[PDB]
Amino acid sequence: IETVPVKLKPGMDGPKVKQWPLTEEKIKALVEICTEMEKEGKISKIGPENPYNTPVFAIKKKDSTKWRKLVDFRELNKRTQDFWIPHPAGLKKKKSVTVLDVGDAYFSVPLDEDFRKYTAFTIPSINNETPGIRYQYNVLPQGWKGSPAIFQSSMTKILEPFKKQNPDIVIYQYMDDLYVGSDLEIGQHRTKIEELRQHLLRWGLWMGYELHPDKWTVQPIVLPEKDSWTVNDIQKLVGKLNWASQIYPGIKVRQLSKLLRGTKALTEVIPLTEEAELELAENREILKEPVHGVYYDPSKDLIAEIQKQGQGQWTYQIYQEPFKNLKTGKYARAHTNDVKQLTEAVQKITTESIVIWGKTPKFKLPIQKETWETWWTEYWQATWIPEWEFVNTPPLVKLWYQ
Amino acid sequence: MVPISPIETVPVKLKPGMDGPKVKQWPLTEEKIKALVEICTEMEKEGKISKIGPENPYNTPVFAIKKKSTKWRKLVDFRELNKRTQDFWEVQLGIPHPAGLKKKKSVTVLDVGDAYFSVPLDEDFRKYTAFTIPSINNETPGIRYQYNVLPQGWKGSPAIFQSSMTKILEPFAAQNPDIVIYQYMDDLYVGSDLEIGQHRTKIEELRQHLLRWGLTTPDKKKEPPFLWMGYELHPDKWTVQPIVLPEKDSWTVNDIQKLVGKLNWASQIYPGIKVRQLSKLLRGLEVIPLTEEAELELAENREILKEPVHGVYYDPSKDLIAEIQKQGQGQWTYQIYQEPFKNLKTGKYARMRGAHTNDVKQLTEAVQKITTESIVIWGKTPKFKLPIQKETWETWWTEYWQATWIPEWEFVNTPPLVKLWYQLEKEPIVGAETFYVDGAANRETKLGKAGYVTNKGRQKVVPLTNTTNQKTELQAIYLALQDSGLEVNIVTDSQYALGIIQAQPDKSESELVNQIIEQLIKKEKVYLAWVPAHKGIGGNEQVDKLVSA
Numbered sequence A: 001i002e003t004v005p006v007k008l009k010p011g012m013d014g015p016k017v018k019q020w021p022l023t024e025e026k027i028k029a030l031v032e033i034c035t036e037m038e039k040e041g042k043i044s045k046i047g048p049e050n051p052y053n054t055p056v057f058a059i060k061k062k063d064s065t066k067w068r069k070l071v072d073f074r075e076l077n078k079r080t081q082d083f084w085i086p087h088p089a090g091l092k093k094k095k096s097v098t099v100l101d102v103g104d105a106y107f108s109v110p111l112d113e114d115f116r117k118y119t120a121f122t123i124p125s126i127n128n129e130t131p132g133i134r135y136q137y138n139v140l141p142q143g144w145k146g147s148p149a150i151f152q153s154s155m156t157k158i159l160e161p162f163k164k165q166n167p168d169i170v171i172y173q174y175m176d177d178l179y180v181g182s183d184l185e186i187g188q189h190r191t192k193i194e195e196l197r198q199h200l201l202r203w204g205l206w207m208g209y210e211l212h213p214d215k216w217t218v219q220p221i222v223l224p225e226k227d228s229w230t231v232n233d234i235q236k237l238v239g240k241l242n243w244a245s246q247i248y249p250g251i252k253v254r255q256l257s258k259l260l261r262g263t264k265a266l267t268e269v270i271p272l273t274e275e276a277e278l279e280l281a282e283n284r285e286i287l288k289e290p291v292h293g294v295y296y297d298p299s300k301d302l303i304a305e306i307q308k309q310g311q312g313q314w315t316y317q318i319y320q321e322p323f324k325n326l327k328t329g330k331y332a333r334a335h336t337n338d339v340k341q342l343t344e345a346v347q348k349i350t351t352e353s354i355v356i357w358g359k360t361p362k363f364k365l366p367i368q369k370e371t372w373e374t375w376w377t378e379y380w381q382a383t384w385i386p387e388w389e390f391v392n393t394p395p396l397v398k399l400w401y402q
Numbered sequence B: 001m002v003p004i005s006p007i008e009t010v011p012v013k014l015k016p017g018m019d020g021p022k023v024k025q026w027p028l029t030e031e032k033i034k035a036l037v038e039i040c041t042e043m044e045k046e047g048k049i050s051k052i053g054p055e056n057p058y059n060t061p062v063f064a065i066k067k068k069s070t071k072w073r074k075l076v077d078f079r080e081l082n083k084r085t086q087d088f089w090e091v092q093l094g095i096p097h098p099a100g101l102k103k104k105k106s107v108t109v110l111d112v113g114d115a116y117f118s119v120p121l122d123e124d125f126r127k128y129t130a131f132t133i134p135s136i137n138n139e140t141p142g143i144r145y146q147y148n149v150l151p152q153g154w155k156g157s158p159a160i161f162q163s164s165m166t167k168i169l170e171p172f173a174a175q176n177p178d179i180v181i182y183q184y185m186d187d188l189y190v191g192s193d194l195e196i197g198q199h200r201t202k203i204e205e206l207r208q209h210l211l212r213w214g215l216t217t218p219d220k221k222k223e224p225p226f227l228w229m230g231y232e233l234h235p236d237k238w239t240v241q242p243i244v245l246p247e248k249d250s251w252t253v254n255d256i257q258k259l260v261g262k263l264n265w266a267s268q269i270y271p272g273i274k275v276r277q278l279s280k281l282l283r284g285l286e287v288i289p290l291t292e293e294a295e296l297e298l299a300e301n302r303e304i305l306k307e308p309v310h311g312v313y314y315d316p317s318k319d320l321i322a323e324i325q326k327q328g329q330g331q332w333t334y335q336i337y338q339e340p341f342k343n344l345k346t347g348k349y350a351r352m353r354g355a356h357t358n359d360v361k362q363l364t365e366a367v368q369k370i371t372t373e374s375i376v377i378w379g380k381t382p383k384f385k386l387p388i389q390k391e392t393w394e395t396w397w398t399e400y401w402q403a404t405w406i407p408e409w410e411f412v413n414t415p416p417l418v419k420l421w422y423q424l425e426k427e428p429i430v431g432a433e434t435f436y437v438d439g440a441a442n443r444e445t446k447l448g449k450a451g452y453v454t455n456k457g458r459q460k461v462v463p464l465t466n467t468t469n470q471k472t473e474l475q476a477i478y479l480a481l482q483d484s485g486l487e488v489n490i491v492t493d494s495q496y497a498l499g500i501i502q503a504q505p506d507k508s509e510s511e512l513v514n515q516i517i518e519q520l521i522k523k524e525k526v527y528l529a530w531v532p533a534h535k536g537i538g539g540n541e542q543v544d545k546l547v548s549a
């Protein structure tokens, strides 16, 4: 009922980010939505004296048909002072985890009157034939990094009853998301989730996203098992082994290259010497153990790389230092839209990253900027948005992960 | 007296930590001062300014300019006060494009140079607007004035004027959805599809509604066509203002840079306009000789410009179509239309500056640009007609290492067709000779060698001058391609060359890449394999020795 004082970083102005083109249907959804939010006092029109701006658009969450307003607060969040939730290392270990959109709770808390001007956004018009409808926020806005940090006191209270009643459940909050982990059976699971919606309606949001840990975290590197090796097979193996030697100490290829002794046809079969096989086996051994000195450090950036492998398969690795992977994965679930798949891959990787480390990674996307910037908002369904850059040079490494 | 509602003020502030202006009132002639005093007395009479006492420490210089007329004009120079005023939210940042307008049966334009003065200025901010008419012979105190209304030339007049008109007009537009309203400078545009009787009625209702705020508009005393932002707007069609390509038997850098502006502007409706060579003549205000390639490209601009072309307005009930053609030299041209041959607009796309490229990638980028342009103008993606076969597109995107996509589209068979010029093998080729290639160069002497060693005992090493490791690694591949049959396996340790060929260029800045491309086009099958250097991989080792000597 009384606002929390918030201010940007020292010497940083509010965001001045141009609105990007919206389709007619997204414009219409936003007009209807913003009209009601104004009627409900969550937002208010503003005049030309406010110079700041943040982009806005419209998504559809997964398995619903109603448009949702998404403000891309990425710039405001960078400029929003740091606010002083810890990360529960047990969340990633629960048999299951459901994800709940609680961003609607925020609209009940006023916003520091002096900060409001910074939540400025424009609904554009087609062909700019009418002035953009401009608004700012009066309440905590979805997607702002402050909104969880501020509501954090009110949310602890709303939960204490349920937490004290189920001391085995883990509960974590990132952006407008509540992550509720369990170790029960889905049916018992679903109900307790239904339970947890009642506190919020009682204190007052029906959607639930499923999610279980993987198995390996860092998928092992594996070598072929063959009864006959062509020269090509051995050339690919030595290449893969040499790559892996930047990650793992004692990888040796002397005895395998030895086999490639001369100028043979790529398809000719080489029987492996006894040395050769031994060397291949010691490398196999090595690859089973973990990497050495591989630690997460919450002060540094997480980095996610994605490779398109074809046939709806996508590989990815999350690291901080090169060759020190904290997680590696594969994804194969849009059978004709490369960009929808990539966009779903980015969302899935970002979700895993929130559950493991409580923050989002910086993506290196195997796509041209202009394609990605002209199509990702059509397939986006999360209420957060990570950072990204663009790989323009084909990695030679895509092979080592297939 | 009919009561008039006030125009609520817009809070203005100066930039943080900055303060008003304090600049010297220039000395004037007695003839000029006399003229200022009369004008400023009439503005004060009307309400636009007010006399201030001497506490005000701010000053903006003021001038008198002779109307090219025996009458003088006053000119307050706020360049200084502007630097110190806050930023505003501009809305005119995006201007509409005529292709996005709808056809109107009737269209009027009111003029609003009277209301702009019914727009008060934020009280707390007037003080910053002080100016001084110097006195005759400097023997009295200068007269001191400040503004009570948005001043011509102030940083915040456009925004605040627009925003105030908008809010006035809003209820009237909402209660008349059968018309459109749009405001720019002192000009209000009202169009509709009503019969002229009903249309002139509503223009009357509009003037009445503007009277509620005491805003007086011209009497029935224009109509189509309008000149606006360099367009000619008619009720059922639009085109640019005329495009006259000057004749010149001697062209200079200022003349060539202005010939690409005109061609660029005209390229939004005049189909197939090109600007490559002329734009190139500007690479990196000197008379430059037009190449023979620029005089045949200019002679093609003058014949496309010979007569006028018109564009149609947008009919939301019909699909949008966009059609692209390959012009050559990384140039693309497109048209957007709903009914055959009646374009709403046209345009062109140019290759991004890179070292290597291919047609499919360029087509894709042009599609993306047309796509974003269409979201801006019509709120939707057009359907595409593209000179590329469905099978070609499918081969491209399923094998390309990046993610790529183009929206709903159909093949249109209008040459030249975009195609894939070669495809590398996924597996080594049985029965094809295996070429182990290698190349090396001495960083100091720029001397190196390139060559290959094959499984049939074929061999070659060529000595080279003025080369680099990178150039010898490509030359080696080039040699193996030159000396092999229609099917061939090639082993290289060059990550450099791999990165280039796996990009699948069809054209290059490097003539060495282009020769390789030309060889690849002639092969039936090529499998390109990579091995790490210096690991003693057979053949790679052999040929490394031969080329590193």
Ligand SMILES: N#Cc1ccc(Nc2ncc(Cc3c(F)cccc3F)o2)cc1Cl
Pocket: A128, A129, B096, B100, B101, B102, B103, B104, B107, B180, B181, B182, B189, B190, B191, B224, B225, B226, B233, B234, B235, B236, B313
């Ligand atoms: N002759 C003529 C003529 C023919 C058709 C139209 N149609 C139209 N649809 C939307 C608008 C508003 C508008 C202008 F009226 C003017 C500039 C920008 C703008 F957004 O106008 C307008 C005119 Cl002026």
